[PDB]
């Protein structure tokens, strides 16, 4: 009768414009909560990128949730991907070399956002496009890793933020509270979905 | 296509958590935009309350909008409305010892609004404001649709004005959760 909801960001500049849209109280550093009659909008900021941040957060994860959401900035490996996109995330993999047995987990897509898939890496991603690459991230795969321990939905919301290459990063430099405010803008309508 | 939204606040406290759902660019003072690809998100916030601020801001009208929306606080004249519900406007008149049809916003419960020049409980009154006849009647003269978004704040006694003063941040957080759903459908 009450949902619960979970919002993941590896950055607070990620999470900025979310962070706007309520008037979040905030419980414990990098962690604010908005409790309403129909919904409890949680949102935890990771305090570092990747694995090491979602293991430092996440690790119990907490029991109770009906869904999280990851939400964050993407690098495109594909030039065909426009940036400022919002996409919903259908499965997610950890990139290793190519003769490794992939492992890919299933998410749970968000309605009314296109499609994507979603690669996690370790080490920032810059050598170019290619190939069985759409969208590329550091923390999607170990939050879904974490979130299936609790058997909890895992969903993802990311928008294209840069091409991986060097080049890229001078999108992301110059449109930090356009992207930021993409998220903000697909996570509006999850809430509303439900007050 | 472009819509093209007027948003009317009162003050700025009413205004304030819906001008926090968006980096809205400010020049003029009182006077806020976002301008994306698919909605032009105007926010205007009334100098002043009442007829005084309305004929300041809006006589003459704006032209070239597709729709006003005016968003605001409400007393409630009639026990039997609870506070803080957001309601959208079917109709609106001036209190007198001619009543304005407004386009009411889907989803929100339907309320009637009466506008006062000067701020107990009566019977015949549902909502009560101070901007909203006078909106509705500048946006008659560039033909613009106009609806309104009415929270209930207090009850339209000596004591019920407690919870307004109380509960400002979340009275204006109602008005913000209604209208991002009306950018979000145009997206």
Redesign the interface.
């Known amino acids: 009768s009450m949902f619960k909801l979970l919002l993941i960001f590896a950055d607070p500049a990620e999470a900025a414009?979310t962070l706007?849209?309520?008037?979040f109280s905030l419980n414990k550093e990098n962690f604010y909560t908005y409790h309403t009659e129909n919904v409890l909008l949680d949102v935890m900021v990771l305090k570092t990128w990747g694995y090491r941040g979602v293991v430092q957060a996440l690790s119990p994860p907490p029991s109770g949730y009906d869904l999280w959401i990851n939400a964050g900035f993407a690098g495109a490996a594909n030039p065909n991907i426009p940036l400022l996109k919002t996409y919903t995330i259908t499965s997610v993999k950890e990139l290793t070399p190519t003769t490794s047995v992939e492992e890919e987990l299933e998410v749970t897509p968000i309605p009314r956002l296109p499609l994507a898939q979603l690669t996690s890496v370790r080490s920032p991603y810059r050598d170019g496009f290619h190939e069985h690459l759409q969208l590329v991230d550091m923390e999607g795969f170990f939050i879904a890793k974490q979130a299936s321990l609790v058997a909890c939905p895992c969903s993802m919301i990311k928008v294209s933020s840069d091409y991986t290459t060097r080049e890229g990063q001078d999108f992301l430099k110059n449109n930090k509270?356009?992207l930021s405010?993409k998220l903000?803008?697909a996570i509006?309508?999850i809430y509303?979905s439900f007050?």
């Open positions: 414009r706007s849209l309520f008037p509270v356009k405010q903000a803008e509006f309508p509303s007050i």
